[PDB]
């Protein structure tokens, strides 16, 4: 019996129920509500009632841990929401708020249902309020499998992570017809809101998958990292890997020349456990890396610069990416580990015309507000305000480390030499820049002041990180009483 799904598969596409079956465990899905009708009675809609009413909501179970989910249905009315569709979603989110369980939704709606009038707006508003209230209480993940237009786009935005499917998905606020009507330009749906556009240009989508099957397979892996609720502790899984594994290849990663580049992944991979990195937003703002990883069987958060791309310089997009990652990680009590290599901020008129001052402050706010244990490692250099922003010791950092060839200075040697000698005799470059770099572009001064705990061999990083992260397991820090902060938007 394979009835009524032949029409769907013929278009090389899967069904909502099949997606739900693929996500959860083999036999642990219990559909909650299945016999519900729209009761519209307008515009010749009194007929063609549907039992499911276009939504599939259940409970399920992943890796032995509970979950909640819902999936849109494209065959029935195009997946449009109504006064009645939104009730099921509201009930699921409320139940997942009472119990410490997350929510995952597979969006496929074609837009609002016009035949209901303003009831669709009512349902949208209720879903928006539930998302707003419960953000930071239970993790929310959203996946977009098909078209997603109109005002329905906003609820995925408030969710913590949004993923996209490559061939047959798109998302935008207004359709290309209106764009043609007002501006006069003919742009296709994919050219407007395709997965690539949101992966590279707008920065909304947190990832892209080639197929639905791969999407489910990796969504399970992502779910294996998250904590169940706000009050539950960070999960710890058994692992045969051990902190005594030898990592001596880190002694040679940093080149002896100051103008040559290297890949920061060569430093990230040895420290964490084998094959346990899940990069977030891999194709957007490549000069910074963010993602999840495990250290001795417990999930941690990774944020590191990359001198491979644009000399590892902070920017607007990198600031937004890092700020969102830090805020989410702190909201759910996940340790943060950072690797620092920054020469400063990206210079240019477009930057000031785009508001670098606002955006660069977001990362600093996220780092200063955080109360989870932090570990910082300075590999090569840290200059100016970039050193302050990237989790400096003064921002209530727990432990800070440096490598023997690091440099921590106010600015580059040339600018310091220029400002320290206004009209000093010519040729001052040769006998002053070298001396200043020798005397003050070294971690000795910063260690004398007390800004780094110790200068360590690069081969001891795994040992030190495991020791510190084990000791810091029970830190309790609290901020002054506030209704909420006022972050620079």
């Amino acid at each position: 019996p394979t009835a009524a799904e032949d029409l769907r598969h013929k278009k090389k596409r899967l069904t909502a129920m099949e997606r739900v079956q693929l996500f959860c465990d083999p036999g642990t899905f219990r559909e909650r509500d299945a016999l519900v009708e729209h009761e519209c009675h307008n515009f010749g809609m009194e007929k063609r009632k549907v039992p499911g009413d276009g939504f599939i909501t259940g409970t399920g179970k992943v890796f032995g841990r509970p979950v909640f989910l819902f999936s849109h249905d494209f065959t029935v009315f195009g997946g449009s929401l109504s006064r009645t569709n939104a009730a099921k979603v509201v009930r699921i989110m409320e139940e997942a708020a009472k119990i410490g369980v997350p929510v995952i939704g597979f969006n496929d709606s074609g837009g609002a249902r016009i035949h209901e009038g303003v009831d669709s707006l009512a349902g949208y508003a209720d879903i928006f309020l539930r998302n707003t209230l419960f953000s930071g209480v239970i993790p929310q993940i959203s996946v977009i499998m098909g078209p997603c237009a109109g005002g329905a786009v906003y609820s995925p935005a408030i969710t913590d992570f949004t993923f996209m499917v490559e061939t047959s998905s798109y998302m935008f606020v207004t359709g290309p017809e209106v764009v043609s009507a007002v501006g006069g330009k003919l742009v296709t749906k994919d050219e407007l809101g395709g997965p690539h556009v949101h992966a590279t240009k707008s920065g909304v989508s947190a990832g892209t998958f080639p197929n639905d099957i791969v999407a489910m397979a990796q969504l399970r892996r992502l779910y294996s990292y998250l904590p169940l609720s706000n009050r539950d502790p960070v999960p710890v899984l058994p692992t045969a890997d051990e902190r005594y594994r030898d990592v001596s290849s880190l002694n040679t990663v940093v080149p002896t020349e100051v103008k040559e580049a290297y890949d920061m992944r060569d430093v990230i991979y040895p420290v964490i456990d084998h094959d346990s990195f899940f990069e977030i937003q891999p194709q957007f703002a490549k000069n910074i890396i963010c993602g999840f990883a495990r250290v001795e069987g417990r999930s941690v958060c990774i944020i590191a610069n990359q001198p491979k791309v644009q000399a590892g310089v902070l920017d607007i997009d990198s600031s937004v990416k890092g700020a969102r990652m830090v805020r989410f990680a702190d909201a759910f009590n996940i340790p943060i580990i950072t690797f620092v290599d920054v020469p400063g901020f990206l210079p240019g008129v477009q930057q000031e015309y785009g508001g670098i001052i606002r955006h660069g402050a977001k990362l600093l706010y996220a780092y200063a507000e955080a109360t989870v244990p932090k570990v910082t490692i300075i590999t090569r250099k840290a200059y100016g305000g970039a050193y302050d922003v990237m989790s400096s010791k003064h921002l209530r950092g727990d432990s800070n480390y440096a490598w023997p060839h690091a440099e921590i200075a106010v600015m580059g040697a040339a600018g310091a030499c220029k400002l320290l000698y206004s009209k000093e005799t010519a040729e001052q470059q040769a006998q002053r820049i070298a001396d200043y770099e020798k005397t003050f572009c070294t971690p000795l001064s910063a260690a004398r002041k007390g800004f780094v705990d110790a200068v360590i061999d690069p081969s001891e990083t795994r040992m030190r990180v495991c020791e510190d992260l084990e000791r810091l397991a029970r830190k309790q820090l609290q901020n002054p009483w506030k209704k909420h902060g006022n972050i620079p938007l």
Binding site: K12, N211, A240, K259, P307, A311
Partner: protein, 131 residues
């Protein structure tokens, strides 16, 4: 051992050693007799559903290569209008005190005009043109 390379397997007397490269949870990168393969391990539902999945073909473009970011060209490696092979460095831009090195991803030859040394122009120009 989980997430490790060596895998010792012994059926009866026969003994074999294979290697485990990596995976994306549907495809396994395993080495057999010093050769890489990608075995697919999927259940009944995944097998019956993988037939109904689009398989797009990636762009096969043999054309000019552009510099991703502005900078300065200080060193060049390849010659104008000769053979080029995959993985060969082509030139090196230096920007904000940093020498990168864009190479040739994959191709057989080129037809183009070289950007001369010290040409601080970049801005996503056509440094090398592949034809």
């Amino acid at each position: 051992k989980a997430s490790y390379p060596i895998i010792r397997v012994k059926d009866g007397e026969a003994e074999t050693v294979l290697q485990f490269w990596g995976t994306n949870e549907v495809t396994y990168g395993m080495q057999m007799r010093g050769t890489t393969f990608d075995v697919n391990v999927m259940s009944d539902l995944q097998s019956t559903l993988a037939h109904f999945v689009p398989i797009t073909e990636a762009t096969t473009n043999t054309k000019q290569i552009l510099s991703p970011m502005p900078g300065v060209i200080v060193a060049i490696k390849v010659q104008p209008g000769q053979m080029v092979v995959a993985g060969e460095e082509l030139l090196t831009l230096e920007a904000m005190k940093m020498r990168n090195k864009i190479h040739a991803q994959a191709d057989g030859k080129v037809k183009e005009v070289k950007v001369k040394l010290g040409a601080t122009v970049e801005d996503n120009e056509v440094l090398v043109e592949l034809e």
